[PDB]
Design a protein around this nucleic acid. Structure first.
Ligand SMILES: Nc1ncnc2c1ncn2[C@@H]1O[C@H](COP(=O)(O)OP(=O)(O)NP(=O)(O)O)[C@@H](O)[C@H]1O
Ligand SMILES: [Mg+2]
Length: 752
RNA sequence: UUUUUUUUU
């Protein structure tokens, strides 16, 4: 851990993924990627008559009450009339004028209002009325920390402005964008805007950028703020709006050089808060029982429940479904429809929560229970929801500086997050929020506002992205909350060994290429260098499988058959190889002749994970074809098949290698020299003394997950920069026989 | 035996 200098061979020159990347960049230079399409817009004329940035509320309202659309040529529908009548009475509308009067005279502003006042929906439209996006050929961006948020609000606003979704108003998500060339109002995730910022540093396409729910302080959000602070210095024609329902606005104002704060009072509908007098021993059972209680007793309305993970959510779903059916049968309760909601679900299955409440034949109020993670915690309006059940728990990221690794842990939520969850109700109609914790806990136990992501997350990718933005001196760079210089330096070190950054500190073609991929830098470099080993398709598949949650299903009470079913796909010396076998068998014609989903439910495999993996693989394949990477493979008959795959794996995961103790028990890592063991779910039954691993996991003991045997020769060949003897501490178990391998190599060279 | 969220079809 006490690293210091150590001269080593040039990583950039010795890296095979770098050569692969030079090839890729050259091929990209040969056929330049097609430029963006200019934006299509109405030439306007009913807008003229006003000096720029001086739009009043009265004029905007006069344009609104008109029979024709100001931005399109369409005539207004009765739906638009009703929706207008509804939204004109929103608390945010009464302050419209003032908002304008600030937005016109300030370059950067902060906005704080009550939950469900109409911030995300009405503010960008106000911006549209003051600005001239169609005349100056620019777009306007509203940023949501969620996919579903952006999609849903895009739908709602599309209905509000009487435009077809995907035309003038649209959303852009990594798996699907509805943004065309006529799109003026663009809802998007912070990651998408970050990508557009990575391809275009100054974001010339946008004249006004809005960041909603900035209280979460996600990675992309903070990076975007840090960038925009400099962008505003370069171009004064850009305006930035920071929105949130709750915030420590002092930090934001002081960061953006004494920026103005607009706080709007007023509540659309009252949301009542209920606290438990005592502490709930088991939050899950408490959640289930309380949901069933609201189902049995409370008035008509749908229930929104928050939980931890997808496993817990599924369990809660089947339990609430069962006992709910028993409630309908024996106690004559109304029909109940439970819908799950988490990120790993397809957008359709996520959309399934907006379905109407069940019809009633008996007269008893039928209702819907939406069991979701914190994906619906921020900026999302469900029409049917009246009740909100909150255990007060979520899954958050924890990072150990000693180990330098990040994992997920169940943690108590924040005060802001609780105000958000409670703020999900009381929109369509007055809401009731049951919090499964004491008010004393809310006042003291709950954190003020969730620890920032930068201060938590590993910065191995963040640095690469920041470098892609065009930031040279990251140490001097203006963050809102600067991370630990130690972590930064070690990250730069990792990227230096991966040959993404040269010795001078600039971006290599390998880095510039690997930045475009939605992968962890190691996975990226691996994938890039894959086709040089003539096995890029297999490596692609493996990466896709590593990008998806655990495929294998293992029942608590039926472990034997599951372990056998896994042993069928199992391959000696390699977990990755086994994964490749699994996907190759899932995509096989035979598995389709059986029943795919049936076949997955016959071989103890997760269909959701497999289909998600197929999707991810398709995306990555499209990107590889876009940045001109050759899809290459070799015959199974060739003995260098497995060897090629292993080598390509080492190309990106050379820093994560373990060596078994010579004449002892357990393993030890090359990096940082830590005593470790092999995870029980690993296929390798024999003692391979040299292994490459994918995950580092701490539980009962320090375990190493997902491994594959490798020859030290290959490691020396691929990454000479990291495996020069000069880098590592004095005579330890690793170095002692590593030097023997070196003696071997030198004898080989000596004999020739 | 332990993937909340996000990252150009
Ligand atoms: N079908 C619908 N979809 C979305 N909103 C609806 C719908 N029907 C009625 N509304 C109302 O329109 C409002 C949408 O405005 P919204 O952008 O969600 O406010 P908000 O303040 O940004 N929410 P938040 O910032 O997370 O506290 C909702 O609060 C609802 O009251
Ligand atoms: Mg909002």
């Amino acid at each position: 851990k006490r690293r210091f200098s150590s001269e080593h061979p040039d990583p950039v020159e010795t890296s095979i993924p770098e050569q692969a990347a030079e090839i890729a960049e050259e091929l990209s230079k040969q056929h330049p990627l097609p430029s963006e399409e200019p934006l299509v817009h109405h030439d306007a004329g009913e807008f003229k008559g006003l000096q720029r940035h001086h739009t009043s509320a009265e004029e905007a309202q006069k344009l609104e009450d008109g029979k024709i659309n100001p931005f399109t040529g369409r005539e207004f529908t009765p739906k638009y009339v009703d929706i207008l009548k509804i939204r004109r009475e929103l608390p945010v509308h009464a302050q419209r004028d003032e908002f304008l009067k600030l937005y016109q005279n300030n370059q950067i502003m902060v906005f704080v209002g009550e939950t469900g006042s109409g911030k995300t929906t009405q503010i960008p439209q106000f911006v549209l009325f003051d600005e001239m996006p169609h005349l100056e050929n620019t777009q306007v961006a509203c940023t949501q920390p969620r996919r579903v948020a952006a999609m849903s609000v895009a739908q709602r606003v599309a209905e509000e402005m009487d435009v077809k979704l995907g035309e003038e108003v649209g959303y852009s998500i990594r798996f699907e964008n509805k943004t065309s060339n006529k799109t003026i109002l663009k809802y998007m995730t912070d990651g998408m805007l970050l990508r557009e910022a990575m391809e275009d540093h100054d974001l010339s396409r946008y004249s006004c950028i809005i960041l909603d729910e900035a209280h979460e302080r996600t990675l992309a959000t903070d990076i975007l703020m840090g960038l925009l602070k400099q962008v505003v210095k370069r171009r004064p024609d850009l305006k930035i709006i920071i929105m949130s329902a709750t915030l420590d606005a002092e930090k934001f104002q002081r960061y953006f050089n004494d920026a103005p704060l607009l706080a709007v009072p007023g509540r659309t509908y009252p949301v009542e808060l209920y606290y438990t007098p005592e502490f709930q021993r088991d939050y899950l059972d408490s959640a289930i029982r309380t949901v069933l209680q609201i189902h049995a007793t409370e008035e008509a309305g749908d229930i929104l429940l928050f939980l931890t993970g997808e496993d817990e959510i599924e369990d809660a779903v089947r339990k609430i479904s069962l006992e709910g059916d028993q409630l309908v049968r024996e106690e004559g309760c109304g029909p109940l429809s439970v819908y799950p909601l988490y990120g790993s679900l397809p957008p359709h299955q996520q959309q399934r929560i907006f379905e109407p409440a069940p019809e009633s034949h008996n007269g008893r109020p039928g209702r819907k229970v939406v069991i979701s993670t914190n994906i619906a915690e921020t900026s999302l309006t469900i029409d049917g929801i009246v009740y909100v059940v909150d255990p007060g728990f979520s899954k958050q990221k924890v990072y150990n500086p000693r180990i330098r690794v990040e994992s997920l842990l169940v943690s108590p939520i924040s005060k802001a997050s609780a105000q958000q969850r409670a703020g999900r109700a009381g929109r369509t109609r007055p809401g009731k929020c049951f919090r499964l914790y004491t008010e004393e806990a809310f006042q003291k136990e709950l954190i003020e506002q969730s620890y920032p992501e930068i201060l938590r997350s590993n910065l191995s990718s963040t640095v690469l992205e920041l470098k892609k933005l065009g930031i040279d001196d990251l140490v001097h760079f203006d963050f809102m909350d600067p991370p630990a210089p130690e972590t930064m330096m070690r990250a730069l070190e990792e990227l230096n060994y991966l040959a993404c950054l040269d010795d001078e500190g600039n971006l290599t073609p390998l880095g510039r290429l690997a930045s475009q991929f939605p992968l962890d830098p190691m996975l990226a470099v691996m994938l890039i260098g894959s086709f040089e080993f003539q096995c890029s398709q297999e490596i692609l598949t493996i990466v896709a499988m590593l990008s998806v949650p655990n495929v294998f299903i293992r029942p608590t009470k039926d472990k034997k058959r599951a372990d056998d079913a896994k042993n069928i796909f199992a391959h000696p010396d390699g977990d990755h190889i086994t994964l490749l076998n699994v996907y190759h068998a899932f995509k096989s014609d035979e598995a389709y002749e059986y029943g795919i989903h049936k076949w997955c439910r016959d071989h103890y495999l997760n269909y959701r994970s497999l289909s998600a993996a197929d999707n991810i693989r398709s995306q990555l394949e499209r990107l590889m074809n876009r940045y001109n990477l050759e899809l290459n493979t070799t015959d199974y008959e060739s003995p260098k098949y497995f060897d090629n795959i292993r080598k390509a794996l080492a190309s990106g995961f050379f820093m994560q290698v373990a060596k078994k103790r010579s004449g002892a028990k357990g393993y030890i890592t090359v990096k940082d020299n830590q005593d470790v063991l092999i995870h029980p779910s690993t296929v390798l039954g024999h003692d391979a003394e040299w292994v490459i691993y994918n995950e580092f996991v701490l539980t009962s003991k320090n375990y190493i997950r997902t491994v594959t045997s490798v020859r030290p020769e290959w490691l020396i060949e691929i990454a000479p920069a990291y495996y020069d003897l000069s880098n590592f501490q004095k005579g330890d178990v690793k170095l002692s026989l590593e030097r023997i391998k070196e003696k071997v190599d030198r004898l080989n060279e000596l004999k020739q």
